[PDB]
UniProtKB/Swiss-Prot annotation:
Changing F114Q: Completely abolishes transcriptional activity. This is Nuclear receptor ROR-gamma. It is found in: Nucleus. The chain holds residues 265 to 479 of 518 of the full protein. It is linked to Immunodeficiency 42: An autosomal recessive primary immunodeficiency characterized by increased susceptibility to concomitant candidiasis and mycobacteriosis. Candidiasis is characterized by persistent and/or recurrent infections of the skin, nails and mucous membranes caused by organisms of the genus Candida. Mycobacteriosis is characterized by infections caused by moderately virulent mycobacterial species, such as Bacillus Calmette-Guerin (BCG) vaccine, environmental non-tuberculous mycobacteria, and by the more virulent Mycobacterium tuberculosis.
Length: 215
């Protein structure tokens, strides 16, 4: 665990994310101008809550599938025992999706990428969960303020998954050793990119799963 050793891991995780990001940043950023029309928004609003759940759950599960593939090609993750792998994914994958979602959020007009175009939070009125949606938009807004780089998401979301303090882990030391190397990679990269400032500005680790309440 020296200089090139850790830099191998940085590049290792950044490749792993690049290959499992589902939606390209270049796509999301260009698509920002393509906003839903008032007709289309009403169109979405008239739908049943059930059709909105179905649509939403589809894409979100699909997202979780991509997060698993990211987890699978993190070195060390496969060496963990069956039980420990699933514990980490059960407590992490939704938190990872939530972070990854900030790339799909235009902070200028307060809109999100959903089914082809960008819409505001009034788009999901059918769900009747305005409280939860606001907080999701809030959380995305603050992470947009930091201008999160692709590599930074890659590294941070690796650290979201690989947590030694998850309840019900058999080989805690095996996870510990893994979490530690990823912290080193994360901290080394921020140092290397003059981006240490963001550490202090990241949401606390009990704020991610405070949103997963009526979930
Ligand atoms: C990087 O993480 C993301 C970000 C957005 C989306 C996804 C994954 C999955 C595909 N998707 C789609 O809309 C489906 C589709 C794919 C494509 O090429 N074109 O369209 C988006 C998405 O699901 N957005 C959405 C935004 C708010 C919500 C909340 C209701 C939680 C606010 C939500 F459930 C989903």
């Amino acid at each position: 665990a020296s200089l090139t050793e850790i830099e191998h891991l940085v590049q290792s995780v950044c490749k792993s994310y690049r290959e499992t990001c589902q939606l390209r940043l270049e796509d999301l950023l260009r698509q920002r101008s393509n906003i839903f029309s008032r007709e289309e928004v009403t169109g979405y609003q008239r739908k049943s809550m059930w059709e909105m759940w179905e649509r939403c759950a589809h894409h979100l599960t699909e997202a979780i599938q991509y997060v698993v593939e990211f987890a699978k090609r993190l070195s060390g993750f496969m060496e963990l025992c069956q039980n420990d792998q699933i514990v980490l994914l059960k407590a992490g994958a939704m938190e990872v999706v939530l972070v990854r979602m900030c790339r799909a959020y235009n902070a200028d007009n307060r809109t999100v990428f959903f089914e082809g175009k960008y819409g505001g939070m009034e788009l999901f009125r059918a769900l009747g969960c305005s409280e939860l949606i606001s907080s999701i938009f809030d959380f995305s807004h603050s992470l947009s303020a930091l201008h999160f780089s692709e590599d930074e998401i890659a590294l941070y979301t690796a650290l979201v998954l690989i947590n030694a303090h998850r309840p019900g882990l058999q080989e805690k030391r095996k996870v510990e050793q893994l979490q530690y190397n990823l912290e080193l990679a994360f901290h080394h990269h921020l140092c290397k990119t003059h981006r240490q400032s963001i550490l202090a500005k990241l949401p606390p680790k009990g704020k991610l799963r405070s949103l997963c309440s009526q979930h």
